[PDB]
Design a protein around this ligand. Sequence first.
Ligand code: CUO
Ligand code: CUO
Ligand code: CUO
Lengths: 416, 416, 208
Amino acid sequence: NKVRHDLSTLSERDIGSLKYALSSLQADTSADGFAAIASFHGLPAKCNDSHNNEVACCIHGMPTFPHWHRLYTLQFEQALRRHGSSVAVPYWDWTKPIHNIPHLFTDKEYYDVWRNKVMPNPFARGYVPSHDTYTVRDVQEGLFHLTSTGEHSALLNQALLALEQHDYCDFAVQFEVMHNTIHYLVGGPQVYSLSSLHYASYDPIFFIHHSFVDKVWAVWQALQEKRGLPSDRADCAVSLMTQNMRPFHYEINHNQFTKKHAVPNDVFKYELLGYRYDNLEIGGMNLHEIEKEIKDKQHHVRVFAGFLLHGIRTSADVQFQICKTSEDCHHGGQIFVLGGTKEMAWAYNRLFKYDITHALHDAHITPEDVFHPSEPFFIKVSVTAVNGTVLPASILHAPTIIYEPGLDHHEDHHSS
Amino acid sequence: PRSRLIRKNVDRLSPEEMNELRKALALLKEDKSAGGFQQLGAFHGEPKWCPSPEASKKFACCVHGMSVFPHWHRLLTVQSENALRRHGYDGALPYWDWTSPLNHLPELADHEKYVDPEDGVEKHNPWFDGHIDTVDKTTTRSVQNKLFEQPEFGHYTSIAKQVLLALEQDNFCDFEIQYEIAHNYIHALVGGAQPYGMASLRYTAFDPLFYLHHSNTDRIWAIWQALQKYRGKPYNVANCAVTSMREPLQPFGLSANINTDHVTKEHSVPFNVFDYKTNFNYEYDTLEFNGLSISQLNKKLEAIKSQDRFFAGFLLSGFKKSSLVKFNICTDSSNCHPAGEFYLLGDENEMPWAYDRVFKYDITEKLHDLKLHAEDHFYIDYEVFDLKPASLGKDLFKQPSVIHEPRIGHHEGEVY
Amino acid sequence: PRSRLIRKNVDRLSPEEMNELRKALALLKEDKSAGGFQQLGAFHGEPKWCPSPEASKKFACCVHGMSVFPHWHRLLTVQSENALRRHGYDGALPYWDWTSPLNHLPELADHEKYVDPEDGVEKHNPWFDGHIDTVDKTTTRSVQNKLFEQPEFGHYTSIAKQVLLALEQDNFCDFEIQYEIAHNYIHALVGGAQPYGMASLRYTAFDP
Ligand code: CUO
Ligand code: CUO
Ligand code: CUO
């Protein structure tokens, strides 16, 4: 029914359709409409029910999380289709370094038209009617990615690592974190922005970014197929899997396909959605190639940093540094987490690993050498809210230093 | 010199051996020294040594809800054992194999007084109980008779089942969670209602049964390591929580008047604790679970995995720790049936801890009786009660997940 | 540029100067910014910024019972002063010489509303009081009338006596203790009974 293309790939004609569709989307007062559609993600929280007790609708820090957002994108796509969008919503490939913020989203005014009328760009932003606030974005230039390889950006590295994981659960943990980065980048400090859990859904970038993440997640399933394991089946988070995903289950969403799809178990087969992607590729590697690419990574030994993510109450940035037994320390790396008060707290069942290895090497510190005197690796954590003071470390669990045996289950060739 | 002590089952002990224990413990109780019993009891709970003894916020000394947990306890038993040897007890601390069904409580612990033929003077069993100096109270024990042998059939026991599952986990961390909780059951069983007893975290150390139970628990851990050895994984090395293992555990670490034992102090590092025999010259007469041999056990374990199973997962905040939790599966339309129960030991004094991962319980058998399908939707109602009867608000507690662990089809391709 | 501001006694202030203060403070109250009044008030007491704002044990920001005490307060006044100047107040914060006996409270602070000849619109004195956003309450003041001039003879005043003794101390630390306590008297005098006022440490900052 539908193909998804990159934002850059979008032609003017294609974009023009999108431009109009969103405009009409905004107009749609109905529940299917954009204002209503946005609330599904977060505030206002309709999620448990309209009743006062409420939590954020979206599932985060949960394995259901990719399912929900995936479903969420379809809702918009269907909306646009109703609106007459010619194409599926595009995805903003974050992984590649961004010379500049995409024109379609960036331009505040959409001047081009046969009419040559000047209008606001629905893509640029939207406003929150309930809050009567307006969306805002504070972006860091740093997003323009610079890296040694150039190709391997932080997102690329993080995404790739997630990619190499048979375990879905393990995949999701890594998968979600990479996803988090964009919300932080665009939102910045702004309370009302992507950076905020409730507010974020309002920004139209949200759909674009999510399209990409969804695209990547889909690739993972395809990769899994390449691996030969069932893409559909999920080992853990079964409890979560069963639960129907509101508000999709609810009548509020007119969309029929979403309703049946509400169980996240069903969400896995994207094909049921009937939307496809122009190509399934991550950074130039084919699915086949990527599988090949990941195996080589396994050959090398790696050291990991383990994160136990309790979740922070306000959206928060965490910083990591590696310190020598002496005073010296290095910026190990940073990860972002997004969560509102509404978030209805979740915790990661498993450890979130980050590849310390590169940095340690920069340290000219081997995994063998001893980081701290008490236990071999003790590090000082730093956690900050997007705004506000630091959150207490004490609650947080101790750092884990991981050494990883490269051997998976891969033989160069079977016999014939 | 006979340095290597042997831990045997309590039942096994000859009267000569029993007599030695009776005498040794009695002397042990008397020992005023730090090495003495009262002082030793302090390590586990109140009085709380864990931040420096002269010091305000006093939280309990014991690693609970941590991977470190078996290491600390293992050290603790040795500490007691060494003390008895000083007393002149010939053997090692005996282990009460609770897993097996008990016709009755062991006579050694159970009877109030030992009338010994040595002279004929009738003396209260030091084994029976001890008194807490701190609180002017005596340890008490109230145990549910129900623990008495009532197998579904033969060997099958709740403990055996619970322990067995723990045994299956390859990774230590996963093993520990299952492992720890099973450990909790005995405390609850023996202590029962009384506020002063095995039931309470602070009190438990005082009861002499504590050592016997832990000896068994340590024994179980040892078998796990042997099983891991059989598995091919190095028993001593632990993949997870490498960092935590390095840090030493107090009070053993104090290595001062507080801890006389040199052995334990060196041993404080949990990494060291793994190789029990060399470091701690103690052994178990047999490392076996039930009738099964180690190789026997592994084979048996594989059998369980082969079949599909359903589990409920619990995230244990373990905040209102001393309490019993019982959960039952209730049909949508029909009856409820007791799913099973687990116990958490925790005094107010204990420091807060939370499980990184979920604890799994095998729901499957009960559902089968219900003839409930895995697919069918049932609701699990779980109630936690304090040791004293009372209802604790479950609402804050996160709902348990229900997970199905299927065999993947019958994977034709990987294995013939 | 007239950077150097001058602090004068409140009584001294001319109506022109007074008007400037009235306007400036009013704007000052409005200022949402961190620079704004509400934010500035926070420094002294609640909300308690002193361990990092995002943070649990919140103890009050002010140095009290410490030698540091006059330094901190001195900085605080300047902070307010700078704020008013941004508002466009010509002068410096005026000082109410409490040591001298007061026939009555100063008119600037005292009267409820200023009817200014500027246009004739009757406006509540921003000087009179402010409202605490944090607690949904307004600052109040109850003062003992007794403070009114009643000298044993002439100049002799309790405050003068108390201040004088502080003055005598050569060493700063000894000076500070006497100095601080004398300082305390006004808070008590103005605040009196009300829980929201000069009397309470948290509340005091709010009152102008
Ligand atoms: O996660 Cu809910 O927003 Cu991207
Ligand atoms: O564990 Cu601390 O008590 Cu058996
Ligand atoms: O001192 Cu803090 O208040 Cu005048």
